[PDB]
Design an enzyme around this catalytic site. Sequence first.
Site, mmCIF file in Angstrom:
data_model
loop_
_atom_site.group_PDB
_atom_site.id
_atom_site.type_symbol
_atom_site.label_atom_id
_atom_site.label_comp_id
_atom_site.label_asym_id
_atom_site.label_seq_id
_atom_site.Cartn_x
_atom_site.Cartn_y
_atom_site.Cartn_z
ATOM 1 N N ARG C 37 0.882 -1.169 0.000
ATOM 2 C CA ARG C 37 0.000 0.000 0.000
ATOM 3 C C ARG C 37 0.903 1.198 0.000
ATOM 4 O O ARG C 37 2.141 1.076 0.057
ATOM 5 C CB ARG C 37 -1.024 0.088 1.173
ATOM 6 C CG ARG C 37 -2.413 -0.411 0.806
ATOM 7 C CD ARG C 37 -3.513 0.339 1.571
ATOM 8 N NE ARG C 37 -3.457 1.751 1.219
ATOM 9 C CZ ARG C 37 -3.790 2.771 2.032
ATOM 10 N NH1 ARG C 37 -4.266 2.544 3.273
ATOM 11 N NH2 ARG C 37 -3.668 4.025 1.591
ATOM 12 N N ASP C 70 -1.274 -0.596 9.293
ATOM 13 C CA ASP C 70 -0.348 0.259 8.594
ATOM 14 C C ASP C 70 1.109 0.054 8.981
ATOM 15 O O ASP C 70 1.963 0.283 8.184
ATOM 16 C CB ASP C 70 -0.741 1.709 8.803
ATOM 17 C CG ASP C 70 -2.176 1.987 8.358
ATOM 18 O OD1 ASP C 70 -2.559 1.555 7.251
ATOM 19 O OD2 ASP C 70 -2.919 2.659 9.109
ATOM 20 N N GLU C 197 1.624 13.738 4.673
ATOM 21 C CA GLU C 197 1.657 13.170 3.326
ATOM 22 C C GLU C 197 1.701 14.173 2.154
ATOM 23 O O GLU C 197 0.858 14.105 1.248
ATOM 24 C CB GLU C 197 0.428 12.266 3.165
ATOM 25 C CG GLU C 197 0.423 11.217 4.250
ATOM 26 C CD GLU C 197 -0.779 10.318 4.195
ATOM 27 O OE1 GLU C 197 -1.832 10.756 3.649
ATOM 28 O OE2 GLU C 197 -0.651 9.169 4.701
ATOM 29 N N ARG C 212 -2.188 16.854 3.157
ATOM 30 C CA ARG C 212 -3.438 16.428 3.771
ATOM 31 C C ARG C 212 -3.478 17.103 5.157
ATOM 32 O O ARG C 212 -2.591 16.886 5.989
ATOM 33 C CB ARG C 212 -3.445 14.890 3.883
ATOM 34 C CG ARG C 212 -4.377 14.239 4.923
ATOM 35 C CD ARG C 212 -4.155 12.763 4.867
ATOM 36 N NE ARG C 212 -5.018 12.011 5.765
ATOM 37 C CZ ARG C 212 -5.059 10.682 5.825
ATOM 38 N NH1 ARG C 212 -4.294 9.947 5.022
ATOM 39 N NH2 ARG C 212 -5.812 10.065 6.734
ATOM 40 N N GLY C 217 -9.255 20.332 7.870
ATOM 41 C CA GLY C 217 -9.491 20.770 6.489
ATOM 42 C C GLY C 217 -9.945 19.739 5.427
ATOM 43 O O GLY C 217 -9.378 18.622 5.299
ATOM 44 N N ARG C 290 -13.318 6.485 -0.500
ATOM 45 C CA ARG C 290 -12.226 6.574 -1.482
ATOM 46 C C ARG C 290 -12.648 5.825 -2.743
ATOM 47 O O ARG C 290 -12.205 4.695 -3.014
ATOM 48 C CB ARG C 290 -10.964 5.945 -0.899
ATOM 49 C CG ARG C 290 -10.399 6.781 0.225
ATOM 50 C CD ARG C 290 -9.363 5.972 1.024
ATOM 51 N NE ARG C 290 -8.816 6.859 2.041
ATOM 52 C CZ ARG C 290 -7.816 6.582 2.846
ATOM 53 N NH1 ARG C 290 -7.201 5.417 2.764
ATOM 54 N NH2 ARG C 290 -7.423 7.490 3.730
ATOM 55 N N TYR C 324 -4.934 6.610 -2.132
ATOM 56 C CA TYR C 324 -3.872 7.656 -2.224
ATOM 57 C C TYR C 324 -3.551 8.131 -3.666
ATOM 58 O O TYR C 324 -3.590 7.351 -4.655
ATOM 59 C CB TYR C 324 -2.603 7.133 -1.577
ATOM 60 C CG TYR C 324 -2.611 7.243 -0.080
ATOM 61 C CD1 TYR C 324 -3.824 7.442 0.631
ATOM 62 C CD2 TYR C 324 -1.405 7.121 0.653
ATOM 63 C CE1 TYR C 324 -3.816 7.547 2.020
ATOM 64 C CE2 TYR C 324 -1.363 7.257 2.040
ATOM 65 C CZ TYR C 324 -2.569 7.465 2.729
ATOM 66 O OH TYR C 324 -2.553 7.596 4.106
HETATM 67 CA CA LIG Z 1 -9.101 16.233 6.001
#
Ligand SMILES: [Ca+2]
Lengths: 388, 388, 388, 388
Positions: C37, C70, C197, C212, C217, C290, C324
């Site tokens: 990933r 992860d 990231e 990000r 945000g 996603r 991503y």
């Molecule tokens: Ca965000």
Amino acid sequence: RDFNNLTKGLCTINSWHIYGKDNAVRIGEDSDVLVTREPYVSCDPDECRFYALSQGTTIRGKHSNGTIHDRSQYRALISWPLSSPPTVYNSRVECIGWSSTSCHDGKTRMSICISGPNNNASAVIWYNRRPVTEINTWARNILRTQESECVCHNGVCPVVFTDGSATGPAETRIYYFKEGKILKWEPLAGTAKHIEECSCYGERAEITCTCRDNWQGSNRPVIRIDPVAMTHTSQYICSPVLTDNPRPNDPTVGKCNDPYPGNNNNGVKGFSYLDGVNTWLGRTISIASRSGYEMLKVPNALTDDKSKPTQGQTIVLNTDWSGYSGSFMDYWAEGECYRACFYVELIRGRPKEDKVWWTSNSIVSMCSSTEFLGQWDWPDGAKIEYFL
Amino acid sequence: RDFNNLTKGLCTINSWHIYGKDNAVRIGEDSDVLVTREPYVSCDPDECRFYALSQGTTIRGKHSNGTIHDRSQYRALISWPLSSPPTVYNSRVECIGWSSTSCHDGKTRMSICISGPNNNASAVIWYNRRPVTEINTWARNILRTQESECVCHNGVCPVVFTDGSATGPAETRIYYFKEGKILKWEPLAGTAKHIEECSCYGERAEITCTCRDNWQGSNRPVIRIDPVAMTHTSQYICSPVLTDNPRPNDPTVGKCNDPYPGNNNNGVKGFSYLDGVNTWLGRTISIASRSGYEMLKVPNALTDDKSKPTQGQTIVLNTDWSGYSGSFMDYWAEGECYRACFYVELIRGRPKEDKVWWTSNSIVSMCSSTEFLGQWDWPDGAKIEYFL
Amino acid sequence: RDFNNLTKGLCTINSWHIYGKDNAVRIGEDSDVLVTREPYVSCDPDECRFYALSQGTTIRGKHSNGTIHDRSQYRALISWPLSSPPTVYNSRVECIGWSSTSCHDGKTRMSICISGPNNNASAVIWYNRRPVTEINTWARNILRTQESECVCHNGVCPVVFTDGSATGPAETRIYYFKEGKILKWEPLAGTAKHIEECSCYGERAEITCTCRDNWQGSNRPVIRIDPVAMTHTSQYICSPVLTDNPRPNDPTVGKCNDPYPGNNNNGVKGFSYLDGVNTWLGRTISIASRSGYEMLKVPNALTDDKSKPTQGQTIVLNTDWSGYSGSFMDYWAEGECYRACFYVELIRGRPKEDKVWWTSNSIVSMCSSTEFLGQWDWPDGAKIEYFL
Amino acid sequence: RDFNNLTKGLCTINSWHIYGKDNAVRIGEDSDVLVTREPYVSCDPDECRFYALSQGTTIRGKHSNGTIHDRSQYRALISWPLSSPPTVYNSRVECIGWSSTSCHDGKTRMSICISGPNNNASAVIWYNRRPVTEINTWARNILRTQESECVCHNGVCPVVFTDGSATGPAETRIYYFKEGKILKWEPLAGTAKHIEECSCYGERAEITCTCRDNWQGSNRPVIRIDPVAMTHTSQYICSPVLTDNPRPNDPTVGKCNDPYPGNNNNGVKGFSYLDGVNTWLGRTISIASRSGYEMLKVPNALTDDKSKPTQGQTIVLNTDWSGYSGSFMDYWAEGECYRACFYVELIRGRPKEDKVWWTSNSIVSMCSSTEFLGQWDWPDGAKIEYFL
Ligand SMILES: [Ca+2]
Ligand SMILES: *[C@@H]1O[C@H](CO)[C@@H](O[C@@H]2O[C@H](CO)[C@@H](O[C@@H]3O[C@H](CO[C@H]4O[C@H](CO)[C@@H](O)[C@H](O[C@H]5O[C@H](CO)[C@@H](O)[C@H](O)[C@@H]5O)[C@@H]4O)[C@@H](O)[C@H](O[C@H]4O[C@H](CO)[C@@H](O)[C@H](O)[C@@H]4O[C@H]4O[C@H](CO)[C@@H](O)[C@H](O)[C@@H]4O[C@H]4O[C@H](CO)[C@@H](O)[C@H](O)[C@@H]4O)[C@@H]3O)[C@H](O)[C@H]2NC(C)=O)[C@H](O)[C@H]1NC(C)=O
Ligand SMILES: *[C@@H]1O[C@H](CO)[C@@H](O[C@@H]2O[C@H](CO)[C@@H](O[C@@H]3O[C@H](CO[C@H]4O[C@H](CO)[C@@H](O)[C@H](O[C@H]5O[C@H](CO)[C@@H](O)[C@H](O)[C@@H]5O)[C@@H]4O)[C@@H](O)[C@H](O[C@H]4O[C@H](CO)[C@@H](O)[C@H](O)[C@@H]4O[C@H]4O[C@H](CO)[C@@H](O)[C@H](O)[C@@H]4O[C@H]4O[C@H](CO)[C@@H](O)[C@H](O)[C@@H]4O)[C@@H]3O)[C@H](O)[C@H]2NC(C)=O)[C@H](O)[C@H]1NC(C)=O
Ligand SMILES: *[C@@H]1O[C@H](CO)[C@@H](O[C@@H]2O[C@H](CO)[C@@H](O[C@@H]3O[C@H](CO[C@H]4O[C@H](CO)[C@@H](O)[C@H](O[C@H]5O[C@H](CO)[C@@H](O)[C@H](O)[C@@H]5O)[C@@H]4O)[C@@H](O)[C@H](O[C@H]4O[C@H](CO)[C@@H](O)[C@H](O)[C@@H]4O[C@H]4O[C@H](CO)[C@@H](O)[C@H](O)[C@@H]4O[C@H]4O[C@H](CO)[C@@H](O)[C@H](O)[C@@H]4O)[C@@H]3O)[C@H](O)[C@H]2NC(C)=O)[C@H](O)[C@H]1NC(C)=O
Ligand SMILES: *[C@@H]1O[C@H](CO)[C@@H](O[C@@H]2O[C@H](CO)[C@@H](O[C@@H]3O[C@H](CO[C@H]4O[C@H](CO)[C@@H](O)[C@H](O[C@H]5O[C@H](CO)[C@@H](O)[C@H](O)[C@@H]5O)[C@@H]4O)[C@@H](O)[C@H](O[C@H]4O[C@H](CO)[C@@H](O)[C@H](O)[C@@H]4O[C@H]4O[C@H](CO)[C@@H](O)[C@H](O)[C@@H]4O[C@H]4O[C@H](CO)[C@@H](O)[C@H](O)[C@@H]4O)[C@@H]3O)[C@H](O)[C@H]2NC(C)=O)[C@H](O)[C@H]1NC(C)=O
Ligand SMILES: *[C@@H]1O[C@H](CO)[C@@H](O[C@@H]2O[C@H](CO)[C@@H](O)[C@H](O)[C@H]2NC(C)=O)[C@H](O)[C@H]1NC(C)=O
Ligand SMILES: CC(=O)N[C@@H]1[C@@H](O)[C@@H](F)[C@](F)(C(=O)O)O[C@H]1[C@H](O)[C@H](O)CO
Ligand SMILES: CC(=O)N[C@@H]1[C@@H](O)[C@@H](F)[C@](F)(C(=O)O)O[C@H]1[C@H](O)[C@H](O)CO
Ligand SMILES: CC(=O)N[C@@H]1[C@@H](O)[C@@H](F)[C@](F)(C(=O)O)O[C@H]1[C@H](O)[C@H](O)CO
Ligand SMILES: CC(=O)N[C@@H]1[C@@H](O)[C@@H](F)[C@](F)(C(=O)O)O[C@H]1[C@H](O)[C@H](O)CO
Ligand SMILES: [Ca+2]
Ligand SMILES: [Ca+2]
Ligand SMILES: [Ca+2]
């Protein structure tokens, strides 16, 4: 950059040390290993590699069924890194066919594959990995060649071919190649009566080939080639230490200029190093099948018809399968002499292990030491029961 | 270092010798071999390789189900070493798409892949393994190209594209690339009425393409290109030896400037070598399906509408599957002439072998010999029953 | 031989052409493909490659169970040839860890992996494939970096790291490396309130990163870095075309210097190209998951808080998974301008496809064209049912 | 091009950073990973690689049954790229045998494998990938060597061999090689009473080896070699921090010139870095089995018989298996000092995990940092239950 010249003699051979072993049948029991047979070894100036005839299938693949057959459209000369197994992913195809030879002349590699039906075969001669020359069958009966490396001197690489019967007179020719082009060819001369599968080595500007007389001889024919004059002669190993297979028991006196009788229409590729007192012969230990393998020091074997062993080394025990064997040397090693090497094909599966449908092999290879080294035996190592 | 120039003529073609064979479907029965179709062969100055359109799955993988379809997002032009199979681990991706061509100009390689839905396709032109130029669909109906190698002369590499109907007039264009940049393009000229899948070769500063008229012709259209003037013309092979598939039976007289009728809306990629008396045509042996493959020497086939074979060679028996075939030559071989070569795609699985869910292929390839060599046949060699 | 300098501007972006696609999950259904990933793409002067974090197991291997996590000791930054899948046999390990970045400075490659427990992580900075510098965690809470390529100018390669909370203020630092040695570091400046990231690109001696903001945000923070002065600033993309995920619906007016609210504590790695009227933003099509991926031309997105799309391109349909995405360019392509490129990670398996125990991904990547090319969609292509 | 000289001292060791990890048993659960043991790491001027003794079978292969045995004809020294697993397709065979060492002298690599039955073993010394020298057994009882890299200085590469009993006095010799030729050999000197499996490193023109006294010592013997004078001495690590395994509990005072008693006839390959206050010792955490692994800073361990740890780092938790460990350094890294590195073999399967029939291992490796880095633990990571 320059053509190699055979400028050294053989080193003194006092034993054999292990050089390469691929364990291919063991590994291939569970990985993508190609089915092969007729393996050999050959060096380039920067690398030595394993060579064999692929059967165009993996061992665990269902297409391995029937790989006892020698000649099909699915075969190819492949090479791969020393002591790796011939896998689908690491094998380089040299050329397409079911009989081959290959050698590097110092500047680049010549490889030769023969393909076709029995009555209409042809050799394609590749040089610098491009086809350059083609030779059609002359006797319409399985055109075939060495199944081990050729040897070059100043760009001249002689190669022995045979076309004709396996069980009666055949037509053997010695082609003299340079850059893949034919400089000359000659019909077989001297007293050898049948020639197949020459195993060759070069020293002091002469090439010596120990071959298989399939028709009548249990002693091996020898061809000695002068690659500068491009001429040759042939005879048999005189020694009573007989080195074909199957074969009769050893006598006390051999034959120099005729086949030693007792077995007809059969044999195995083999080799020797013929260098006066520094002479070593390979043979299967069994007289009856391709079982076991030994090296015997037989001083003057070539020329002395009563010569017997003064030293020996076991390579493969008589309770393990062997097969084809042949000669190669690293012509590019540094040093004052050429170190003799050989390989033994360890055949597994059919016809003797017939609970599997396939025939394949692994490789063991040794070079000579000027030490008197301890011996081991080097079997294939696979358990056929695992493949059931 | 310098751009290649087409400075030699064709060698005399007296037969064909085996060049490469990958046995991919046999090997892939039990190893990680990618599903492909539309293969070809192309040389660089130091290496010749196999090329094909991957389907982005292995043959034994469950995703091979449905690989009868020609165009998906999972396809890519791949290349791999000569006579190896296209495996997951040894295949290099050239570019992404479902129609391609590729050729080396002497300094580096240009590769072209087309991708997209039927109505909105685009060509990306890669040069030195970077994308350089893009060309959008002009007729919004499957932009498509050669599916075999292009040919370059002094940096100029012409490429034939077609966009439009498969079964009616279409828009064919000849792009003239240099370093991946468009120097010029022309709409199709001369008397060819429909063009697809050009198979091309270069000699004496001219490029000859033998193509597929999918709409009406069972004779093949030919495009002849002058890569210095960047102009071309087109006609059909005049010979009554008809070389598309499916096709009617051979007549006694062909057509030079129109389609030879009898089959509509169908065809197969094929090739010829058109060189006066040194002219050889490939065709499937069957008139009805992609079965069998032969080479026929048909002197003056291009220009003589009554020309019949004076020699021939079987490549694939009529009891074995064939498929696409195309031309390539090693432009970098040493020697006085260019040796003609071709490959035949051996298609397996659907639609004719429909007990499997996949469609794939293996490759056989030959080059010309100035000898009269014995012939063999070269089938794929796989047993479909093994995949059940 | 010389350090690369960012001397060109961006080419005009009029659409995106397909660049690379590995089909990894499709292929890996039946071949030895590593679970990955966090993929990306990065170029050297002679080669562009795929990069990702391996999970140290194949997809069909039983150890793929649990690869939704992860951070483990079994992860490593690997790279492999463009559009191949990351296999056990063709993947090169760059360094060991569970967060990474990598970039080539024109002379050689710097790669950075972070490993360790959450409270005690460390970065190892490799240069010319040797470890050179190590940086210990400063906030004892998952030291982490870009997960896409860094950019270099005259040997200076800035890299953004964050250590601290994912859901509240954190400590972000910009390290300025040269030959793997730290020249300088700075704490984050300007008005971005949270950074993770960063996806970065270089043009005309400036590096632009789109990041990000995980905390607050749904618009993306931007860091602009001067690699000669070794200084930077930060703000948000002003546009109301919001590009994080998950996110609220698009408003009519965005925020320049604060987070656009509506979603807390979540996000996805993404990217943009911010170049006046030549500005393109990537986003998932879905606001909720996603799913899907599009490119939107949003002139002046960086500086205009009412800017809306004037053009667009579908990359992945909203009925297919994305993940991503990030920026890279071939800084070594020949030509007057830098061609923008990006990749999208296509995540498969858990958490959304939970009938399998694993999580993995494949890659699609595009570069910009100055043509207006037709669009396709580029899904992963795998059938999860095949893995049941 | 020039022979390397040991011209630097050790860098300051303030912690250890992760260097390489192959995850081989995890990956090999479902891919073609060779069974190994006795791994190590060694650098060339352009590349560092993993090394181990293959057992000539894959882990999932049926021939992995019985790989608890140390010496067979199916073993070979292999090497493969850093942090890849030793697979059938990416492993290079260095030489054939069941005990080895290897090191690069700055111009090329020397590799040494020993093979043969217990009573008749021989070393073959390869140099520039050709066999050059052979050494026959001198005590007819398992001729054996380091199982980790040798170190060279100005072309001189000393190598420690032992032949004789594992449980009583044996004959240890130090050979001094150059270009694979023997310059000199010496019998063991100084106060070490038994030597096996030396782990070695070079700094400031001296080579330090930390070895295994299998007969009596739970402290480790040390050999210090002057590769210019070609002389050496030996003693034990004085420290009471005892570093063999199994071992008694740590005392308060160690022994400098004799074995520290308490365990007889057993041990594990290990290593230390002995550099005054910059001294670090590795040991298994368990006193009873090869479980866990730690690094302990023990200032003056070599010479101070009361020295205790002042710092430490966990490498492998005591609930995870370890095994052999050894030293290597990248002698070709740029910089003012040599960075100490080591590897730990993580053994899995028999004898402790006996629900599987095989024994294998994976590798973890670290190098020193002048930072005080956070620690993690690095287990093999495989679930043995998956192999049932
Ligand atoms: Ca965000
Ligand atoms: C550690 O490693 C060491 C190195 O490998 C190892 O020592 C080696 O041991 C092997 C195995 O014994 C030796 O190989 C043999 O060598 C024999 C020749 O040596 C003898 O004859 C010489 C001349 O008359 C003598 O000079 C020589 O003496 C000297 O050396 C001695 C050391 O062994 C030493 O003790 C003495 O002091 C002295 O200085 C010695 O007496 C060789 O003859 C033998 O080969 C034959 O025997 C094999 C059966 O073992 C056959 O397999 C082989 O084919 C040969 O016999 C067959 O053929 C003969 C010739 O034609 C016939 O006469 C025979 O009857 C027989 O024929 C039958 O079998 C055939 C094959 O199946 C068949 O075709 C026929 O039809 C028929 O059925 C063997 O090669 C080796 O030389 C030793 N090497 C060294 C350097 O010493 C040592 O043992 C290992 N140590 C440990 C502790 O394990
Ligand atoms: C060892 O290897 C050798 C080398 O490969 C091999 O010899 C080769 O043998 C093959 C197989 O026979 C030969 O191929 C054929 O060549 C034919 C042309 O040669 C003839 O015609 C010439 C001109 O009139 C003559 O010059 C020539 O004579 C010379 O050579 C002779 C050697 O064979 C020698 O004996 C003589 O002394 C003399 O010097 C010779 O007579 C060629 O015509 C033939 O192709 C047709 O036939 C095939 C069926 O076998 C078809 O498959 C093929 O498509 C061609 O027929 C079809 O098309 C024709 C043209 O349009 C039509 O007229 C036909 O009716 C037919 O049409 C039907 O079929 C079509 C295909 O399905 C279909 O589309 C149509 O609609 C219709 O239904 C074939 O190529 C080869 O040349 C030999 N090579 C050499 C150097 O000799 C030798 O046999 C092997 N040896 C052993 C011991 O195994
Ligand atoms: C062959 O290939 C061709 C090339 O790919 C292809 O043509 C392409 O077609 C696509 C698909 O339609 C086009 O993409 C769109 O572009 C839109 C912008 O263009 C419009 O607006 C401009 C300014 O006002 C006009 O200049 C422009 O006119 C010009 O071009 C026309 C060609 O299409 C031509 O006919 C005219 O004559 C003229 O010259 C045109 O009117 C862009 O707006 C659109 O994106 C939005 O819509 C998508 C839904 O389709 C969303 O997925 C996307 O996110 C955008 O909408 C969302 O966000 C907006 C901005 O914030 C909001 O206002 C919307 O309400 C919406 O918000 C919802 O959705 C969000 C996402 O889920 C969510 O987050 C929000 O919260 C909210 O829920 C799209 O990109 C493309 O430009 C064409 N390219 C070219 C060169 O023409 C052609 O179709 C193919 N041909 C065939 C035969 O198949
Ligand atoms: C983030 O990462 C950080 C870096 O890794 C990590 O900090 C590290 O923490 C580890 C784990 O605690 C530390 O390792 C230990 O170091 C000990 C030595 O340090 C002590 O002693 C010094 C001298 O007297 C003091 O200078 C030193 O003080 C300084 O540093 C402190 C930081 O920890 C600081 O707080 C102070 O202010 C001060 O400045 C400190 O007091 C070392 O002794 C220890 O090893 C022993 O203990 C282990 C058990 O944990 C054993 O496994 C090991 O083998 C050693 O004990 C055995 O052997 C001894 C010597 O012979 C015997 O005396 C013992 O009795 C014991 O013997 C039994 O066990 C043996 C093994 O099984 C057996 O063979 C025997 O027979 C017998 O049964 C350990 O290495 C490390 O140094 C820290 N590193 C740094 C830079 O700080 C931090 O924790 C992480 N942070 C987070 C938040 O997770
Ligand atoms: C990038 O710009 C730098 C800075 O100008 C260039 O570096 C100079 O290169 C020359 C010749 O190779 C050296 O002799 C100078 O010493 C360099 N450094 C400086 C600080 O002036 C660099 O070559 C440029 N990169 C490229 C690809 O042209
Ligand atoms: C591998 C093996 O088992 N080889 C054996 C020898 O061990 C020996 F026992 C022998 F008798 C012999 O020929 O020397 O038989 C062969 C073999 O079985 C046969 O020749 C053919 O089936
Ligand atoms: C491979 C194969 O079996 N090819 C055969 C030919 O052997 C022949 F028999 C033929 F009749 C013919 O077309 O020439 O049929 C084809 C084929 O079956 C069909 O055309 C389509 O199903
Ligand atoms: C791949 C897929 O199936 N993506 C879909 C969209 O097709 C759409 F239907 C949507 F509603 C949406 O979020 O836009 O749902 C997602 C998705 O199912 C969920 O968000 C999470 O489970
Ligand atoms: C991996 C593991 O489980 N290692 C453990 C330690 O966790 C510990 F529990 C210990 F007791 C000990 O020796 O230190 O036992 C060993 C081990 O089980 C045995 O020594 C041999 O069977
Ligand atoms: Ca015989
Ligand atoms: Ca047609
Ligand atoms: Ca001990």
